[PDB]
C-alpha cells in the first residue's frame, strides 16, 4: 500500500515527488511537518552536533560518512520512534549545510543509502510517531 523508503529518498535525496502514491505523499507531508518542528525546537542542539563533526572532518566539510556509523549505532542501542526522527532531522540539516557551506565535494551516497535502509525497518514506528504529532 505504501513504501517509506522512497518517501525518505524524496525528503533526503531530492527524489522527484511524483514517484509517490497518495499514501506515500501523505506520509511525506507528516514527516516534513514533524521534522521541521524538531529542526526548529532543537536548532541549537543540532548545530552543536553539526559544528562538532565539521571540525573533526579532515577536509573541513560536512560528510555523512562521519555521522553514518554514529546514527546506526545509536538506533540499535536506542530504538524509540523519537530517536529515529531526530536522526532524519539531523541528517536533513547536514544535507543542506553540506549544500550551503562545503567548499569541497563529498561522496556519501552509500553512507546515506545505508542509513535510509535502517530507517525503513523502523517505518512502522515512524508512521506511528509522525501520525500522532499530526494532532
Amino acid at each position: 500500500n505504501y513504501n517509506i523508503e522512497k518517501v525518505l529518498n524524496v525528503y533526503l535525496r531530492d527524489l522527484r515527488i511524483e514517484s509517490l502514491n497518495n499514501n506515500e505523499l501523505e506520509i511525506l507531508i507528516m514527516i516534513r511537518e514533524c521534522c521541521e518542528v524538531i529542526k526548529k525546537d532543537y536548532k541549537t542542539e543540532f548545530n552543536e552536533i553539526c559544528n562538532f563533526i565539521l571540525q573533526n572532518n579532515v577536509k573541513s566539510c560536512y560528510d555523512i560518512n562521519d555521522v553514518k556509523n554514529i546514527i546506526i549505532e545509536t538506533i540499535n542501542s536506542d530504538f524509540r520512534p523519537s530517536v529515529i526522527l531526530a536522526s532524519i532531522s539531523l541528517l536533513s540539516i547536514i544535507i543542506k549545510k553540506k549544500k550551503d557551506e562545503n567548499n569541497e565535494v563529498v561522496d556519501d551516497d552509500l553512507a546515506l543509502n545505508e542509513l535510509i535502509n535502517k530507517f525503513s525497518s523502523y517505518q512502522k514506528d515512524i508512521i506511528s510517531f509522525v501520525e500522532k504529532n499530526k494532532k
Binding site: 543540532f46 554514529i70 545509536t74 542501542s77 526522527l85
Partner: peptide, 23 residues
C-alpha cells in the same frame, strides 16, 4: 568509540526531550 558515545548521547537526549514534549 570515544567520540561516538558523546554524539550518540546528544542525539539520544533529543529523543528524550521529544517524548516528554509530546506526552
Amino acid at each position: 568509540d570515544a567520540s561516538t558515545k558523546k554524539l550518540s548521547e546528544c542525539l539520544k537526549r533529543i529523543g528524550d526531550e521529544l517524548d516528554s514534549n509530546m506526552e
